[model samples]
Target chain A: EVETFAFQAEIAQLMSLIINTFYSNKEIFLRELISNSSDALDKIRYESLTDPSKLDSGKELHINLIPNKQDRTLTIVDTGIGMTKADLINNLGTIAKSGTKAFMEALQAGADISMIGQFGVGFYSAYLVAEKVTVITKHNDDEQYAWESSAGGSFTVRTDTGEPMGRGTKVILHLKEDQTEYLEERRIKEIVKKHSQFIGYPITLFVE
Target chain B: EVETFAFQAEIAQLMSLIINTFYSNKEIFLRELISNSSDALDKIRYESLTDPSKLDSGKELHINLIPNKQDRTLTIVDTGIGMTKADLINNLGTIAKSGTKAFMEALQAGADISMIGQFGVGFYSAYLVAEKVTVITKHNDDEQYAWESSAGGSFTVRTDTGEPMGRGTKVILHLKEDQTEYLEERRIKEIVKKHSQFIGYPITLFVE
Candidate 1:
């Protein structure tokens, strides 16, 4: 079963901002997603230091990029600390309860897009390249779950009865027709080399 | 009768960050509060252009700084678009639902805090100098309300039973023992001249 939730008041407004206004640079979405993955990987690494069970599954820490031309989708997979349902709801549902007001103000001023990471809506940058985003994640402490949204007013999170992946997160971006550049290995590699070369983790791109 | 509300998850954390870690520059809190007042004044002015009844009470469009040295309290009052209860809750109770995750990240990265407005926690900067904050406000569309907090983890909003002020908001900062510098008109004038000299609205500072 799936539970649907409304984007918080500012989230809805911010979705519009990212999807419509803030696309001067779209490729940075990869950087943001990868950055998030790196943080998650760092977290699980740190957590496992004390609680060995956190890494009991022993998944290698890395990130993967898969592009499916037929399906018009690009997926970023990371064997990092995936989110629990509460994490999904809290982290994804609300902006920094302390930051949104200023974030909106910053956007209004057309502040630098690099500041995006500072405000936390960096994840939503996926909308710049994809009309829809689907996230499948599994955390050691929780069951597998899928978070899906289309930049509409809301999103849904549901239990994944399908074959569960190892502990990690997979962010699949259903690319917009014009955003097809992200689906190419050459472009993906360029972004990785330029922005993520020193991320301290292997990021592999696969093409069939 | 007051209704207490917990700071949204990230808000609690952000408060701790602002009060404990980010104090290199605390006087900017005045700039932020004044900027907020200007925005409110602009909103009410624009609003009255369409609906004159918004200014029916004829409150001048301005900001007032009231420093009570005897009480060690500093109040910033604005005659502008005031908040209803919902506005109070939504705007103050949570950061940009879309920005918090990144805001926290930004803070962690030691991001420049002028970037603070972009993330919205600029208001909480009040806590840098004050141990507690009290806001009394009245809006044309809603009843008067007071929002109060000590940043101990939660806040309360209650109907204001005291004498009603005209439209707008009044922010009272109960200064910390060492923050008494804020209660001087000279310092306030200096901040205003340096940063808010041309705000298009008069900012009057009342002494003794």
Candidate 2:
């Protein structure tokens, strides 16, 4: 059985601001999501190196982007260590961690730290373009669940309706009309090349 | 007579870094120049309001950009409160009066105080794109003089060759090959729009 977690009010406000105003460029959303995928892949790879059984599921660490023009939706799927429902809410909704504040202070002190995304607001960037987001995830030690949000102040969680895929998670973005450029095959390829061509994992984009 | 001033070694280093690295966007050069022009205009306007004799030249504050494509040069001329020869050397070539340590401390403290440019290094941003820079000016109570430098830790000053153009200053940039963009009317207009659009005085661009 999997247990779900709810976001605190402050976390909800922060998430709203991050999705609405933090990034000046909308294309940066792809970079933030890919970066988060890379982090997840790194975590699982590190864990599996120490415990070989963890890699038993035949999933190669990679990121995949599937765009459906007919439905006006785009999905980023990652074969990484899947998260429990509690892990999803905690990681996705809040940046209550103290390290981020410390890192900001260091930057204010003139310390040269370029990794601003490491402060952990990267996931919420999906709301920059998406009107609705749906996360279908399955964990190795827990039941699969569907987490859906209109990206307002609240989200809904329910039991998965379909059979679980191998392992990992899929994020579906119901993109807004202004963000339809992200659905174009050429634009997606260009964005990937510009920001994440040298990223560690192989990222494949499929357009239909 | 004009007196020469030498900058502190650390300030010289900071000036070079600011010109080369601190602002990666080259268009900001116009911002710094316009900001300085606004300061000069403010001083002259204040004087004109307080002392009618100060406006004896009957010149209104204005900024002009002159592009000489044949010579690969651009000149920014301003009819504001002009500088004395001593004021030119003191304002341009030296950080003698600036509390450099205190200024740096304020910057480190995240204060957005405009004192960094107030200390006199802002004008040198011209060196980032210009191979040679020349300044000609006539002060309200002093004779006109020309100060020339390549920003290589040395400069020369001489009595003005031509009659003073009332009370005003002109800065000419012998632009480097990489800086030919400044010679384009469209580019200069774009730069002015980006940086000096909010300035109170009329700024004209002369393109040939």
Candidate 3:
């Protein structure tokens, strides 16, 4: 009933590890997302001296958390620069896509990973708990689009409609069965007031 | 354990119909591929006279049929121009992508095909019989890549490993259970040779 859009041999083993072993860090993935959505908006505003167009657009920017367990998906959405297909690729994937073909070719040859990092590569650590991640983003510059990947260098960007997030980004994390704790309200609410609530952004968990 | 990437909207419907409606004509899906692959190999050869590469590469162009019933897949691979990722999209999907606004935006206004006329579009008729259609190709201009779709305009292009056809294209038809007749040897041999053998290209079943 699901997907691959790549799995280089080594990428598979690494993802195999991500799909199971990171059971401990899996809890932080939700908090990490809310933390970063605010991070994206704030950082964008702080850098507003640079763009101005995105800010002055008069969009009341806030992050929204809506969890739907029917299909077991938790979404962390935010109002920020959104993403260009280029940004989707370059941002979430710098750790995967290299400046050189030789390196990718090297990885393909069974050479492979280091511990992983951040620029808010903070984006993908979710792989620690999810089977898939879908980004529905609208950058004023490019309208709206979808980027999906199961990790590895292979990802896809396509057109999306009726996705109502006027100009920010909505990231839907498809949780593996064991990861559903992130989808329930009690655990999420507890973690929320615990710390992330004061991060200079309105982080509201959708009620019903 | 394998994969089926997404498709846009209208194409999705057209494909949806193909998935269930045409049990009778499903047998000819193989023939259409033979003619389509032949057309691609033929057209590229003429251009080769003006360009020195393949017109002279002695590639010994052949179309091979290798079916795997356990997985319900029928692959029609060509030793011809194969396909460029761009060609794969444009050729396989011009009308569908002509294009759309969203996922359902594709078919909702409900509509959408034709014989393909070339290596690109016509082959999708196979979609009527299979759940997914995938094209893995390598062109001299680029290494090797894959394009896949379940019907919507949301197809994907990614790197492929272990699929070593060297320089042509491989079209994989993942048959629906109702359509497994396409996987049998007698059906393909009889159907392929019936009329498709008349095309001016080498059409041979892969020798085991």
Clashing pairs in 2: none
User: Per-residue lDDT tens digits of candidate 3, residues A1-208?
Assistant: 1233454454444455455552464565666677667545743554353356667544576888888988788888898767766556444423332212323343454432221322123355578767888889877767677888876557676777755566778889888888788888898887786645444456778855
Fnat score for model 3: 0.00
* Top candidate by lDDT: 1
CA displacement after TM-score superposition, residue B26 of candidate 2 (Å):
1.2
- What lDDT tens digits, residue by residue, belong to model 2 across residues B178-208? 8898899999999898655545567989868
lDDT of each: 0.78, 0.69, 0.62
| Residues A45-108, model 2: lDDT tens digits | 6556546777776448889999998888989988877767666655442233332443345446
Question: Candidate 3, TM-score vs. the true structure?
Answer: 0.42
Off by over 4 Å in 2: A1-208, B1-6, B19-23, B93-120
DockQ for every prediction shown: 0.03, 0.01, 0.01
- Model 3 segments more than 4 A misplaced: A1-208, B1-8, B20-23, B55-58, B91-120
TM-score of chain A of each: 0.93, 0.83, 0.74
The alpha-carbon lDDT assigned to residue A45 of candidate 2 equals 62
What residue runs in model 1 are displaced by over 4 Å at the alpha carbon?
A93-97, B1-208
DockQ of 2: 0.01
- Candidate 3 lDDT score relative to the true structure: 0.62
